[PDB]
């Protein structure tokens, strides 16, 4: 096997349901990296999630006794791996063809190849060609402004610096890197510690990067990125899985009163009379019973409306019931919260 | 507006001071031609129609040399104006005086008196004018650079530089010189302002040509502490903005030491500064006519070299240079009127007008000034300088770092052999 | 007279720094205009002192750029036509101005029309479905091919020059008319000589024996054409012909800066290496089959007979 | 694996030959863990397409090194014979490699030798001994025909380099540069003139190596050879392939340099090993050749590119030739490991 795929499934107010199983676009969050690994080779993949996740290749699930760094998790699964490992993040949604970074890993015999995207704190040094990695440092890491060795500039006179790049945590690692991690157990959090180590030691070890400026490359880690990723899912799911209709599942009791454009609705989520779902993803088993205006909103599952509500730019956790004609704008409703007919502000009310 | 330039014919530093007690640096011949002649030719060719010469040290000799040149003629186009004063002793002191006298009315070119280049400034002119017109006169100076490898002999450690430039508008955000530095420090001020195209460049050669605007003269007048262009750019990049222009197909360099001298002479001899080649005779004088041959062989009128002598590679022969028998001359420039002995080799040496070399001498990577004399059985190790008609004793070898002149406290003792 | 001196000096510096205008015919016409202007704006009594003055001007002119023979040839033409005016009148001093001015005007008017006459012979030489090669940029050859293609279909393969890829411009210009051009490097000449039916290229200066002073790589093309016995055709205007003998010493080819061939960014290896960039090369007349001019097909041996009609032998040495 | 697509209009005289682009790759529609093609072969093809390895000798060395990995990882399926199944399985790999870049004559000879050696695998021999013997045979072939065969050629060419001679070399040939480097340190004091041509401009590779060795050097382009040839005393060229009729196939500029030197009466010598002698015979440069990327022809002369958009014109085609043959009469001496036979009687000795 040329590669061994590993995903690391080990920020708040929505973590009651496990983070790898967060419903994004009416689908599990862990389904996106798994699908990205799928449909391009990769008949096998190792998964290191916890017990709470009960997750096509026969995924190998390795439970974790306690919370630990991602580098520690990689060191924990050494006996299973036998070749160069391809490390992916649990929560990362991209559309990039995986061959772009694999070509850099293959042709140049690079010790490490990784992917980031331009933003839409961290300084990355980029060679004039745009592939070789030269400098990498975090703003809080170094107290001095910016130190560049003269030796690394003698051979690479032109260095391009970026600040808005967002790390996709898509790493292609050589075999001896894992051995080095085993014999050096002080290294943890590969993203913050191991990656800078392999950059300063080149000046053999070579690192290459594939800068993206067209794709999504969303990496959900906070509530803000959670909402943005969902609204960009519908375009992605059309090409990834054209078989399932974007409108609704077959076993549905939807009202058939139109009012749905570019909206994904889950299974058996009954809708009442003349609702309004505009660019919003309705979850599963959501009992809609009246003329509710839902615009650019997320509802996980089992969320019920009662009488003519307004839903705008909000996220609602599971098992939440609104009462009568409450108006909702830019709000977060916890799991089990019962809010009566009133106007809700930006405040993020939690259980 | 008619293009004008400000020419500084005096370098206010002691970097040429085993020699400069006799003649200034601007009058030193590069390849049988004075240093200021190349700068004047470049200014005339680039489109400048008027130049101002500010000479303080040995201004009389500079004025006398300039008045007889082709640039002081009724048929000339680049009219020159010589201004001499012993008051100012710095570049800032001249730039704050050119503002006081209001000589500059538009975008002018600030260039030293020892700059060898053939760069056409028209594109830089258009870019600077467009930037100033579109940005409501925000930019103040466009500094001309030249991309080259850091390992080139032309790039010396003294004049090395590194910049942090936004690639979108090629504007300088940081400027520091790498002299005895192994690591470089760059602030975070430029990253916060714009994170789009910040780029650190180390492959740029300081051409020392910087076209400016009268606002630079006003700023130099305002700040008395400013003395050099480096001080001005350091003070400006800390507190207006400075852009650059990068040249890739044209030559440009300023001499400041013997390393720069040798590099520029080698490049000029090898036609790297075409059309400013020795055989082109860009200055209209009858004593500098040459003839180009294979392997870059330049011969003046009435050389009459001896039998058995071979000119291997890249040698310039002056007018009336007598060469002996069984010689071996390569990569060296010999002035007019020199007398060369027999069985004498010259490798990467430089002989000015009036030198005499006896038979059996071995000179490698050395420099001989006017009217110098070398006796027989004398070996000169690399990087040895003989100045102002100094003579050495027979059967004596000079070490590598051996500079000899007739001044007690500067170098070794007088010419008495 | 100050403006006349300014014009002559400005043209001298223009020649010394960079050849402008690029076209040879326009430069020759400018030389004719300036020579006529200095003719009509000077004081003289006889023909000898005026001939000496023009000789001084031409000597300075070709001392500025020995590699450019057009100015010297045209100065020689002016001297010759002045001698004809004097001889037709001596066989008597003031009335030379009108004769010289009208004759110079006639020469210039004829000089305007040296392109259509050369191109008019394209139908006889070029045929249909025949491969024709041209190296570098030549306006005369470009017009030749473009006017020949107006009624015939053929394949043209253009080889770019090494230091300046000027063949790309010629290929683009020819392809704009639908001629099915092709572009290669200088190294494919011997490889593509197999199917090339004919070679039609231009030149810069025609010497006494019929030799050429074309751009670099012309000698290799002629040698390759001779090896495969493919005829080589040279089209050039009459004024490009020069009375200079092939070569007396070095510097017959002008050397531009070596930056064109090898860039500055190489590094430290530049100090220990010597790189040369010739622009022209010598082509013996034995490699030439025919010449095209305002008269027609002239053999390479039949190049000297025009010297007597064009130039006076006393003016050959200038 | 699909066939590689074409790129741009092709020359009428070169219609039969294939012309591919460099920017596009054949690995886009391939599984990330390679299964149809061996991963080593995929890496070799990716390096070949991008031009990372282009030397005639280095290409063969890399091909045989990858074949060693293929042999080591191969396993015999049940009720199958290694000697024939290995040959059958190796064909798709070389078919894939052909699409990435046309194969050289030395590659053809190496392939034929390896196929013949694999065919002679005994039935009684098991997997381990047969695989070890095959790897040892490949290593011995490399050693005795690649690195050991150059010593004899260098020692033979030693006698043809005397004091005061000037040698005009062309292109970047490993054997030619090695001869000069090995002969300069034995006491001979010569000067080398390096001649090359665009777009590859690979003559700098040997120019810098000669400069670093202390040998005086001179650099100039192909059209300037006729100007510099009068002073040149000898010509040294590398041969990419020796033909059956004696023609020397080499770089595109080789066949013209010999013709130009013949007019100047300068002797021309070519040096190559006997394993580059191919049985095929062909006298032209059209029936068998390789077309490269046409985008390399365009150059940034001045501030603008004359050939920036050549595809817009329907009657303008860019030709990028690679190889051409020279008549045996042009070169008067062929230097091989077996002696100094003349070019005329090359096949008789080489048979």
Numbering used by the authors:
A (entry chain I): 1 to 10, 17 to 61, 72 to 136, 155 to 237, 297 to 444
B (entry chain A): 41 to 279, 285 to 462
C (entry chain D): 8 to 98, 125 to 351
D (entry chain E): 167 to 517
The authors write:
The rate-determining step in this pathway is set by eIF2B, a heterodecameric guanine nucleotide exchange enzyme whose activity is determined by its conformational state and its assembly from subcomplexes. eIF2B promotes GTP loading of the trimeric GTPase eIF2 (composed of α-, β- and γ-subunits), enabling eIF2 to assemble with methionyl-initiator tRNA to form the rate-limiting translation initiation ternary complex (TC). Using hydrogen–deuterium exchange–mass spectrometry and cryo-electron microscopy, we identified a central α-helix whose orientation allosterically coordinates eIF2B conformation and assembly. Through comprehensive characterization of eIF2B remodeling events via HDX–MS, cryo-EM, biochemistry and cellular signaling experiments, we discovered that eIF2B allosteric coordination is mediated by a switch that is triggered both in A-state → I-state and tetramer → decamer transitions. This conformational switch is orchestrated by a highly conserved helix that is located at the core of the eIF2B decamer and facilitates the hinging motion that converts eIF2B from the A-state to the I-state.
The decameric complex can disassemble into two stable tetramers composed of subunits β, γ, δ and ε (herein referred to as ‘eIF2B tetramer’ or ‘eIF2Bβγδε’) and one dimer composed of two α-subunits (herein referred to as ‘eIF2Bα2’ or ‘α2 dimer’). eIF2B tetramers have reduced activity relative to fully assembled eIF2B decamers (later referred to as ‘eIF2B(αβγδε)2’ or ‘eIF2B decamers’). To explore conformational change and side chain interactions associated with the assembly reaction in the switch-helix, we determined a cryo-EM structure of the eIF2Bβγδε tetramer to a resolution of 3.1 Å. Overall, the architecture of the tetramer closely resembles that of the eIF2Bβγδε tetramer in the context of the eIF2B(αβγδε)2 decamer structure. A close look at the switch-helix elements revealed that the side chains in the eIF2Bβγδε tetramer adopt the I-state conformation, with δR517 forming a salt bridge with δE445 and the δF443 rotamer in the ‘up’ position, consistent with the increased protection seen in HDX–MS. In the tetramer, the amide protons in this helix exchange rapidly, suggesting that it is predominantly unfolded. Specifically, in the eIF2B tetramer, the δF443 rotamer is in the ‘up’ position, and δR517 is salt bridged to δE445 (step 1). Switch-helix conformation correlates with eIF2B activity; side chain arrangements are identical in low-activity tetramers and I-state decamers and switch to the opposite state in high-activity A-state decamers. Shown is one representative experiment from a total of three replicates. d, The eIF2B switch-helix is in the I-state orientation in the eIF2Bβγδε tetramer (1).
